[PDB]
Design a protein around this ligand. Structure first.
Ligand SMILES: *[C@@H]1O[C@H](CO)[C@@H](O[C@@H]2O[C@H](CO)[C@@H](O[C@@H]3O[C@H](CO)[C@@H](O)[C@H](O)[C@@H]3O)[C@H](O)[C@H]2NC(C)=O)[C@H](O)[C@H]1NC(C)=O
Ligand SMILES: *[C@@H]1O[C@H](CO)[C@@H](O[C@@H]2O[C@H](CO)[C@@H](O)[C@H](O)[C@H]2NC(C)=O)[C@H](O)[C@H]1NC(C)=O
Ligand SMILES: *[C@@H]1O[C@H](CO)[C@@H](O[C@@H]2O[C@H](CO)[C@@H](O)[C@H](O)[C@H]2NC(C)=O)[C@H](O)[C@H]1NC(C)=O
Ligand SMILES: *[C@@H]1O[C@H](CO)[C@@H](O[C@@H]2O[C@H](CO)[C@@H](O)[C@H](O)[C@H]2NC(C)=O)[C@H](O)[C@H]1NC(C)=O
Ligand SMILES: *[C@@H]1O[C@H](CO)[C@@H](O)[C@H](O)[C@H]1NC(C)=O
Ligand SMILES: *[C@@H]1O[C@H](CO)[C@@H](O)[C@H](O)[C@H]1NC(C)=O
Ligand SMILES: *[C@@H]1O[C@H](CO)[C@@H](O)[C@H](O)[C@H]1NC(C)=O
Ligand SMILES: *[C@@H]1O[C@H](CO)[C@@H](O)[C@H](O)[C@H]1NC(C)=O
Ligand SMILES: *[C@@H]1O[C@H](CO)[C@@H](O)[C@H](O)[C@H]1NC(C)=O
Ligand SMILES: *[C@@H]1O[C@H](CO)[C@@H](O)[C@H](O)[C@H]1NC(C)=O
Ligand SMILES: *[C@@H]1O[C@H](CO)[C@@H](O)[C@H](O)[C@H]1NC(C)=O
Ligand SMILES: *[C@@H]1O[C@H](CO)[C@@H](O)[C@H](O)[C@H]1NC(C)=O
Lengths: 372, 221, 419, 49, 49, 49
């Protein structure tokens, strides 16, 4: 249809150029199948749909801006709704340029994301590694704090403050997304690149390509077949080259998108369904969890990160030579405020008196350097 | 003399196509933006008509009874005596000996204009020239195309800023060789601009109407 | 069988396949034309006592008249009737805007000089034919009218000229040419002579100098409101059907409807963002028509594999179901989905796991006598996590499961010799 | 020769286009396979040993 | 400059081929911008020198 | 010009084919380099930091 629009005098000439149209159709079909597999791999990781818990009293934390809200006709969270009504971008159709619909509709993607979210809130991360095990959310927060080094008593003794900070950050992220003009740049750039490619492909139709006219009907109506065959050949060559260029560009861009989708699936599996200890791969600072949020032709995570704050610096000694024996700390640092010494955790100032419970002895103190 | 500074003027529909909310780019003759249009206030005889000439025809009492195209005149070379009357608008093409204008008082006295006659190849009757009636007279491809648009702003000095698209009225299928033209009028107020090949990006409204255009030669921005 | 032929194999595996491209065929034809009946005076310019001198060639313009060129083909005997850029038989249909007849007389040997780029004294300064030339040339011997025993010296050429004239230029200056150190103050001696010297026109002259009346019919193409329309009909107007049309010179196929976007009084047709013909204006009673392409879409065939069963279904890509006039051996069970019009599939309601993806949720399969069914795909099971604070769940047993995972590593190392 | 050159030139252009298309497809598929092989090497390093 | 070296006739002939190589120029510009982004991503991880 | 147009067309087609081949190869090489740069960025974000 693209090369020779409903013209026998052009199709019977295109038949001479071998199996080119079949090759291009096969390539584009492969690209579409790859896109479907990309979406399925990214979102359809856990195949058990967990119902969204009705209550919102999760010990202080407020999952109102990430959880789906049923008041709207579309079952999308406010952040998902903002993401949808921030990427706006027409329908070519016409000359043999059809657009296939995605397998997983946006409602299905939203339901998958909601299932992942409800699994994260309810069972923590065991739902991604077996059967879901219910556990109170403060306890899950404590068991995610324990992963990054700090002990449980840091969370429980500061549960209200931590919940307030979490709610404040969740509220701030919506304003940050809405106010900033760039925001969703990758998805919009992908859409713009595809639109520009398609528009250029259509624009290549209106070009003489070294012929007498840009319209096949005009050429075949104004000329006898023996001399119109050359002009039709020139037009066919030009259109074939344009289609080949478009197909190659689509293949390369689809490969790039597949790489990005594999990265996104890795992030979804290794962050939402667990907690990663890879530095600065799953957010800035120490990682606690993440919350997936559906977006048009993409995914948008909400990484949650513990990040240290106002610090006080003391004097430290590697070990303590008590009775000739050099006690070393078990799970801490030896600090001191100038007069008294203490052993405390590495990522928080919780001084404790240096007892034999917090230290282990490893011989005489004539070998260590800097022992106090 | 008075050169003024010009504004966004000389924009006309290039062809008879209907584009809606498009930013199509066309390469044709156009009046460059921010050019120096010549104010002639009795200076009719000189008027060095280039390839396409823009005309102001500012707020007046329609004293302009037409135009005289041609260079040698003197009933030797083909001339365009396009005398738009008060009614029925005479379009006459002939080798005409030219002396002066009708000069109907400051009226109904003497429509003399030309003196002699020759072959007189072509004649046309219509109803153009019904205020700031701008004009985009362009003689190319054996076609003398005319364009106009009425905008009675009635302000001081000259055309302040008001953008408009000048719709075509009629063409003229004769191949006269014209490099000079005449203005047929007390004191007057008329400007003459010269066309040059440029490239524009005429922006179309929801319906086909040039709302704003830009010139791809003025400045890097 | 179409899927078998497309796969180039007798065995079809389970899945969705593409076979061909459905496209609605045209039904009627449109020959819309304006009201023109008066005939052009071609025979007038072909029947004259004298045509012109080679330098006084006439440029008679023809416009706003129906011009039938069939008479110029059969009822005439021109020796040279070459037509450049147009087909002489395919010439009674196009409605050109401006057609100029260049009339003059030439010699038998110099009749070949009327070409787009031909050289020679006549073809260099007396007459120039541009490269891009959609017009034709008419020439025949006329040793019966212009023939004078004393010689038709009124016809003269212009050898004495320095530079070749630009295409389609009429030179009138008969002044003496400058061809050297001549003073050219009248003179007519030394190296300056009369450019228009003579035409030896004795009737007994051979066929190489016999009179030949050349009328070059140069006509612009259909890029403007047509005025010189070819003879034909003007069929009425039909709507809401994929038919081919001949609006002036526009040719195409569409389902043209009543246009909503108003036109300016001078604009004829319109285009969308990608310069595609969208709307047109009727050459007959003025009406704006919104031309849109008729329905079309690639057919797809759903098979559960020839090993399992020979039952297959057909999904038309984008047609709105009803447009299935003609495959299609059977029918019934027609189900319209957001991805097309499924045919031969039972639309069940019990959601299952996807087997053959279709699009927009629907996904067909072969589930039991077994038939092909289509359903909304099911995301997963209905496991419920009973959230409750102050309560935890703890395992008491493991399973130690082993899963197999496959990854490609290398392809076949192949090298191709170019030469 | 005078016409055989034209016919051979047409054939040469066609075969050149075909070979270039095949080479481009092979390059893209080999890049994808290299990505898969790098993933396999990472998995072998971080899951087996 | 490459296809038709400072020639008006050859440039006019190339103009009939549409936007065939404006696409190529845009692709190369995108490649250069991507290289700059690559260096920035690898090296400018922390901006607290 | 009416004859030189043919030779100009042949040369233009050849040079366009060469430029397209070069641009496609550059695109593929830039994709590979971007993959390597992403791996290096992950190494810098994961090993030294
Ligand atoms: C959970 O842990 C228990 C720990 O004993 C495992 O139970 C054992 O399961 C095996 C396999 O089903 C039982 O063998 C079966 O027992 C009966 C009687 O012979 C019969 O159903 C079969 O013929 C078979 O032999 C075994 O008796 C049972 N042990 C006990 C003490 O009850 C169980 O396998 C663990 N769960 C999983 C999923 O592995
Ligand atoms: C978490 O579990 C505790 C168990 O103590 C619940 O606390 C009780 O809440 C009820 C209802 O408000 C009060 O009447 C009781 O006095 C509370 N118990 C105590 C010891 O103070 C609490 O409601 C649970 N959380 C949620 C969100 O339901
Ligand atoms: C979670 O935060 C949301 C806002 O993001 C809270 O919703 C607001 O609640 C206040 C009262 O607390 C109402 O006055 C506002 O109108 C609500 N805003 C909207 C947009 O509906 C919500 O109450 C918080 N949830 C909990 C459990 O604290
Ligand atoms: C360093 O910390 C130690 C331990 O808290 C401080 O010693 C205490 O000082 C207070 C008065 O500030 C006394 O009442 C306590 O009895 C002391 N505790 C012990 C265990 O001896 C010490 O003062 C701090 N030093 C500084 C400079 O702030
Ligand atoms: C703490 O850091 C500050 C700022 O660098 C430094 O001046 C001070 O000496 C440090 N305190 C100790 C006890 O080392
Ligand atoms: C051209 O226009 C400028 C700007 O209005 C003016 O200064 C100048 O006098 C005009 N004429 C020439 C010959 O530059
Ligand atoms: C000149 O105008 C008068 C009315 O003012 C009209 O009667 C006459 O026909 C016109 N001459 C033309 C159209 O040649
Ligand atoms: C006026 O033109 C006519 C028409 O061709 C011609 O016969 C006559 O000689 C011309 N008069 C002059 C003085 O040129
Ligand atoms: C253009 O035509 C005019 C007649 O109006 C003539 O005087 C002039 O010489 C012509 N120009 C050329 C270059 O021949
Ligand atoms: C032109 O478009 C505007 C909106 O841009 C609309 O209001 C107006 O009615 C249109 N004009 C005509 C004549 O249809
Ligand atoms: C002439 O054409 C017009 C176009 O508007 C049409 O309305 C009219 O009916 C036609 N007249 C005849 C006699 O065909
Ligand atoms: C499909 O056709 C039916 C029957 O004519 C009609 O009611 C329906 O609106 C059509 N649907 C679309 C999307 O065109």
């Amino acid at each position: 249809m693209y090369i020779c629009g409903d013209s026998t005098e052009c199709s019977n000439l295109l038949l001479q150029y071998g199996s080119f149209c079949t090759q291009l159709n096969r390539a584009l079909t492969g690209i579409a199948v790859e896109q479907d597999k990309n979406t399925q791999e990214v979102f359809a990781q856990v195949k058990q749909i967990y119902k969204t818990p009705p209550i919102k009293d999760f010990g202080g934390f407020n999952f109102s801006q990430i959880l789906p809200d049923p008041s709207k006709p579309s079952k999308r969270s406010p952040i998902e709704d903002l993401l949808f009504n921030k990427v706006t971008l027409c329908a070519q159709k016409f000359n043999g340029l059809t657009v296939l619909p995605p397998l997983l509709t946006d409602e299905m993607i939203a339901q998958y994301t909601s299932a992942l979210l409800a699994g994260t809130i309810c069972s923590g991360w065991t739902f991604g590694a077996g059967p879901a095990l219910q556990i109170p959310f403060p306890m899950q927060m404590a068991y995610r704090f324990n992963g990054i080094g700090v002990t449980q008593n840091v969370l429980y003794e500061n549960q209200k403050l931590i919940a307030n900070q979490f709610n404040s950050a969740i509220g701030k992220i919506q304003d940050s997304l809405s106010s900033t003009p760039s925001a969703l740049g990758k998805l919009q750039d992908v859409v713009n690149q595809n639109a520009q490619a398609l528009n250029t492909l259509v624009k290549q139709l209106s070009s003489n390509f070294g012929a007498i006219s840009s319209v096949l009907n005009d050429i075949l109506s104004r000329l006898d077949p023996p001399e119109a065959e050359v002009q039709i050949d020139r037009l066919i060559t030009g259109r074939l080259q344009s289609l080949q260029t478009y197909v190659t560009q689509q293949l390369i861009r689809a490969a790039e998108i597949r790489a990005s989708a594999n990265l996104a699936a890795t992030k979804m599996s290794e962050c939402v369904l667990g907690q990663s200890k890879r530095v600065d791969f799953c957010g800035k600072g120490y990682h606690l969890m993440s919350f997936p949020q559906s977006a048009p032709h993409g995914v948008v995570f909400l990484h949650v990160t513990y990040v240290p704050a106002q610090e006080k610096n003391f004097t430290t000694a590697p070990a303590i030579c008590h009775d000739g024996k050099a006690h070393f700390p078990r799970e801490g640092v030896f600090v001191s405020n100038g007069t008294h010494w203490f052993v405390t955790q590495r990522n928080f100032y919780e001084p404790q008196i240096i007892t034999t419970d917090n230290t282990f002895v490893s011989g005489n103190c004539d070998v260590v350097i800097g022992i106090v | 003399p008075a050169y003024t500074n010009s504004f966004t003027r000389g924009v006309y529909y290039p062809d008879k196509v209907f584009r809606s909310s498009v930013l199509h780019s066309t390469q044709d003759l156009f009046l460059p933006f921010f050019s120096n249009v010549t104010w002639f206030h009795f200076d009719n005889p000189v008027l060095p008509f280039n390839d396409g000439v823009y005309f102001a025809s500012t707020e007046k009492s329609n004293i302009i009874r037409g135009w005289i195209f041609g260079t040698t005149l003197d009933s030797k070379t083909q001339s365009l005596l396009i005398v738009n009357n008060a009614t029925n608008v005479v379009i006459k093409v002939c080798e005409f000996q030219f002396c002066n204008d009708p000069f109907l008082g400051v009226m109904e006295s003497e429509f003399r204009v030309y003196s002699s006659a020759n072959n007189c190849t072509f004649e046309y009757v219509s109803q153009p020239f019904l205020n700031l009636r701008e004009f985009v007279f362009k003689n190319i491809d054996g076609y003398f195309k005319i364009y106009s648009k009425h905008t009675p702003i009635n302000l001081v000095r000259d055309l302040p800023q008001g953008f408009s698209a000048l719709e075509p009225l009629v063409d003229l299928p004769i191949g006269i060789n014209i490099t000079r033209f005449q203005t047929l009028l007390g004191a007057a107020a008329y400007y003459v601009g010269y066309l040059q090949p440029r490239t524009f990006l005429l922006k179309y409204n929801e319906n086909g109407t040039i709302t704003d255009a830009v010139d791809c030669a003025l400045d890097p921005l | 069988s179409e899927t078998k032929c497309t796969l180039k194999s007798f065995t079809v595996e389970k899945g969705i396949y593409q076979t061909s491209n459905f496209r609605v065929q045209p039904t009627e034809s449109i020959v819309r034309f304006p009201n023109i009946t008066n005939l052009c005076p071609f025979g007038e310019v072909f029947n004259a006592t004298r045509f012109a001198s080679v330098y006084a060639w006439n440029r008679k313009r023809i416009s706003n008249c129906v011009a039938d060129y069939s008479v110029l083909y059969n009822s005439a005997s021109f020796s040279t009737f070459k037509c450049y850029g147009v087909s002489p038989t395919k010439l009674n249909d196009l409605c050109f805007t401006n057609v100029y007849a260049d009339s003059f007389v030439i010699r038998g040997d110099e009749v070949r000089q009327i070409a787009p780029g031909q050289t020679g004294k006549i073809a260099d300064y007396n007459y120039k034919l541009p490269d891009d030339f959609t017009g034709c040339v008419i020439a025949w011997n006329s040793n019966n009218l212009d023939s004078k025993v004393g010689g038709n010296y009124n016809y003269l050429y212009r050898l004495f000229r320095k530079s070749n004239l630009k295409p389609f230029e009429r030179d009138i200056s008969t002044e003496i040419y400058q061809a050297g150190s001549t003073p050219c103050n009248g003179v007519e001696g030394f190296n300056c002579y009369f450019p228009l010297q003579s035409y030896g026109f004795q009737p007994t002259n051979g066929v190489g100098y016999q009179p030949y009346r050349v009328v070059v019919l140069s006509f612009e193409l259909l890029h403007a409101p047509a005025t010189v329309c070819g003879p034909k009909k003007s069929t009425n107007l039909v709507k809401n059907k994929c038919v081919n049309f001949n609006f002036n010179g526009l040719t195409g196929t569409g389902v043209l409807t009543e246009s909503n976007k108003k036109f300016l009084p001078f604009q004829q047709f319109g285009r969308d963002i990608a310069d595609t013909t969208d709307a047109v204006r009727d050459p007959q009673t003025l009406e704006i028509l919104d031309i849109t392409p008729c329905s079309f879409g690639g057919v797809s065939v759903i098979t559960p594999g020839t090993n399992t069963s020979n039952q297959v279904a057909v999904l038309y890509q984008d047609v709105n179901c009803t447009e299935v006039p003609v495959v299609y051996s059977t029918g019934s069970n027609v189900f319209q989905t957001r991805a097309g019009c499924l045919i031969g599939a039972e639309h069940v309601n019990n959601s299952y796991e996807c087997d053959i993806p279709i699009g927009a949720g629907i996904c067909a399969s072969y589930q039991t006598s077994q038939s092909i069914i289509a359903y909304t795909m099911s995301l997963g099971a209905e496991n419920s996590c009973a959230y409750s604070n102050n309560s935890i769940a703890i395992p008491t047993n493991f399973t130690i499961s082993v899963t197999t995972e496959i990854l490609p590593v290398s392809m076949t190392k192949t090298s191709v010799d170019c030469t």
